[PDB]
Every structure is written in C-alpha cells, then in structure tokens.
Write an enzyme that holds these catalytic residues in place. Structure first.
Site, PDB file in Angstrom:
ATOM      1  N   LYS A 116       1.408   3.850  -2.946  1.00 27.70           N
ATOM      2  CA  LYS A 116       1.004   5.721  -3.111  1.00 27.70           C
ATOM      3  C   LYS A 116       2.324   6.073  -2.671  1.00 27.70           C
ATOM      4  CE  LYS A 116      -3.246   4.443  -2.931  1.00 27.70           C
ATOM      5  NZ  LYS A 116      -4.245   4.821  -3.536  1.00 27.70           N
ATOM      6  N   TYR A 148       0.965  -1.434  -0.374  1.00 26.37           N
ATOM      7  CA  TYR A 148      -0.465  -0.022  -0.306  1.00 26.37           C
ATOM      8  C   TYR A 148       0.831   1.314  -0.133  1.00 26.37           C
ATOM      9  CZ  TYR A 148      -3.711   2.985   0.989  1.00 26.37           C
ATOM     10  OH  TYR A 148      -4.551   4.079   1.325  1.00 26.37           O
TER      11      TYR A 148
END
Lengths: 230, 230
Positions: free
Chosen positions: A143, A139
């Site tokens: 990102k 994640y």
C-alpha cells in the site's frame, strides 16, 4: 451511459459498492478482477492471479479498446498480516504486491494512454501504510508503494489527460461482510460504509471538486459519520 | 573465516566490491545472484529471475543451512527509466520489484530466523526514491518500498537478533563500469567509489558503530570525498 469507467477489483466488497454507485447511470462500466470473478452470470473480465504487470496492462487495454475512459478505479485487494519473523510473509507480501501494486502500475498506463480530459485515476492505499507496519509487512509495503505511485504520477502531469487527477484513498476500517463475520458484536462506529466510499468515488469520477491530484485521502469515520480528509 | 555473510546481488558491480571487501578475512561469504551468475568458475548460487519471494526465501535458507549469519547484505539491482506514459514501465517496474523488493523480503526472513546477535541486515535503496520519481516509476517505487521495509523491520526489534540492526543505503551515483562506459568524459567528482561503499558495509557488518537500526543512509560524494549521512 455516455461516460466510461474501467473498474479493477470489481468483485471485492468495495468493488461491488463502487459498481453499484456507477450505474446511476450515465456510466458504462468495464470491470476486471483476478482469480475471484465467478465468471458465471457476471459481465466481468477474469484475469489470471499469476499475471505479469504487462499481461495486466494488455488485458486492461483490451477491455477498453476504442473507448475514451473518464475514470480508472482500482479498489482491488484483501488483507494478510505477518512480520519478517513469519515464513508466510514471503507469499502474502507477493500476493498483496500483485493485487494492489501490479494492478495499479498497469491501470496508470491505460489511464495515461486512453484517459479522457478531466478524468480520474483512483488507487487504493491504507491509512496505516503512512507509517511503518512491522506486523503487516506485505500489506503495508504494497500500500505504501501505491501511495508512492500516486505521488510520482502527479509529480509529472504531462503523463495524464488535461486537467486529469490521480487520487489514493486511505481507508482505516471498512464495514465489509468479512469484518462483520469476524467481530459480529464489535462497536462499528469507526467502520466506514462502502456506500459512502463508493458514492464519493463516483462524484470525484463525475468531476465534482477533488483534492489536488496526488492527494492521499484518509477515510475517517467517527460515530458512523465519515470525512474525506487530506 | 569465523563470521558468515549471505551476499545477495554478488555478481553486480557493487556486489563484487562488497565480496572483495569481505575476504579480509575473517569472513566466510555465501553468495547468491539471479539470471546473471556466470555459473562457470564462480562459487555463486544462480536463482531463477522468475522466482517467487517464497522460492527466494527457500534458496537463501538452503545456501546458509546450519549457519549463524552475522550479516545479510542485499546490493542487488540495476536501473531502468520510464513514466506511466511508457508501455515499457510495466515490465521494468516488475523487474525492479523482483531484483530489489522480492530479494529484500526473503533476505529479511532469513536474517530474522538465522541471524546472529549484533548482526546486520543491509538493504539497497536510492537517494532519489525519498521523493516522487515521475521519470523512473519502476526504480523509485521498488526502492521506496525497500526504504519502507527497512523502517517496518526496525519498528519491531523483537523480529531481529539481540542488538541487530537493519540499514538501507541510499546511493546517488556510483562509479560503476556501466556509468563510465555511458559517459567516458563526464566530471565523476560526485560518483561514489564502490570500494568506499563496500568498505563501509564490511565495517558495519563487523559491528563498528552503526546509525540507528532503521536509518536510511545517503551516500553523498563531493570532490571525490564521501560521507555516509542520515
């Protein structure tokens, strides 16, 4: 319906909020989503989850053929956890990369080549990915890469329409059906309303005052009130 | 040949230099490369360039079954240029992601699960990717992600063997066959010798003094002399 927006991630919780905020309207909305487009009654492009960045780019180019696009909005992506100790991190990191980074690279190219003057490219980062994410490798890496992509696009404005902007939103926690389901009883005072994020994306898209092209915009909620902060 | 190293990118210019530096030796070398392993006389694993991160992970786990690995060294990856204005950036960014980031996520998991105490995980970043890279979107985004991955691994040392380290090298320019061919007449005073990088990787791997686990190590050459700097 004079202005045109390409909406990527249109079938996620934040995507539906954003589509609802467009449609005021004033906007013609061209929507795309991977695997998860119900492709029944929906006027949404279903793209394959195994798509290359070039395949995404072609599918996006096709969806907006012969349009000037005022806004390209990428609010795609879910969440998975995992450290490098977890065997599961390999697949979850690839999934997050595909949902968020593959989509963002393709979306940037369509905005560069078909964007309108004063248009907006908006990507979706994560406030947490400004720092190391040992417990969410996939994640955070995906990102962080979107944040980097946002900055690199802004660093050479000759690649964007005149007076265009790129922005990345950095949510902390969103008030989504998924989070409510997970923790029905939790204090949601710091959980950002999707309507608040969607409404702000549509104002920026309409050419309201924007932070400087390249900004990482943290979405900070306390006592159920929200600021958009750099 | 007491100590074990898994070498990823073994068939690239820096990979051959690193394999040469191991083999002193003292080291048993298990090597893997994508597409480019000549798979004739070579004792190198050829992995498919269309491999998922999970497929890379399984291929790496297989290559070292029943070994404690003192070092996992990832020096894979080439170079491509391109801005978001270029249609070519989609494919080049995916290629750089696969060569550098996919390989690094898989390599980290093998080091976490099969690493030896005092072992080294070494990844390959880019000095240029510490800053926005508008003219090399793929290269910069992929390498920036490796830097982020290096930091995230270090942030929770419980995922690594006892007293293990992760490091990322940030080369500026390497004295490679490719660069010599491109610019035969150029001043190469700032071009780092592959032997110098390889030799430093092997010392760190052997448990010489290392910068703090998590360091981004810039490889800076002036007047043909090299410093390894944080």
């Amino acid at each position: 319906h004079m202005k045109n927006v390409l909406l990527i991630g249109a079938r996620g919780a934040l995507g539906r909020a954003v589509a609802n905020a467009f449609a005021n309207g004033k906007w013609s909305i061209i929507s795309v989503d991977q695997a998860a487009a119900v492709q029944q009654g929906d006027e949404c492009c279903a793209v394959n989850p195994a798509s290359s960045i070039e395949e995404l780019q072609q599918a996006y180019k096709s969806a907006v053929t012969g349009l000037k696009v005022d806004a390209v909005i990428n609010v795609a992506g879910g969440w998975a956890g995992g450290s490098v100790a977890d065997a599961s991190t390999a697949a979850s990191t690839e999934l997050m990369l595909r949902q968020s980074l593959f989509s963002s690279v393709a979306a940037a190219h369509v905005f560069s080549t078909q964007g309108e003057k004063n248009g907006l490219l908006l990507l979706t980062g994560a406030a947490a990915a400004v720092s190391p994410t040992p417990g969410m490798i996939g994640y955070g890496t995906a990102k962080s890469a979107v944040h980097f992509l946002c900055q690199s696009i802004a660093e050479d404005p000759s690649v964007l329409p005149t007076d265009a902007s790129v922005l990345a939103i950095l949510p902390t926690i969103l008030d989504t059906p998924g989070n409510r389901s997970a923790m029905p009883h939790a204090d949601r005072s710091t959980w950002t309303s999707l309507e608040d994020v969607a409404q702000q994306i549509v104002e920026w898209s309409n050419g309201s005052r924007r932070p400087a092209s390249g900004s990482l915009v943290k979405i900070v909620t306390e006592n159920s009130k929200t600021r958009f902060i750099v």
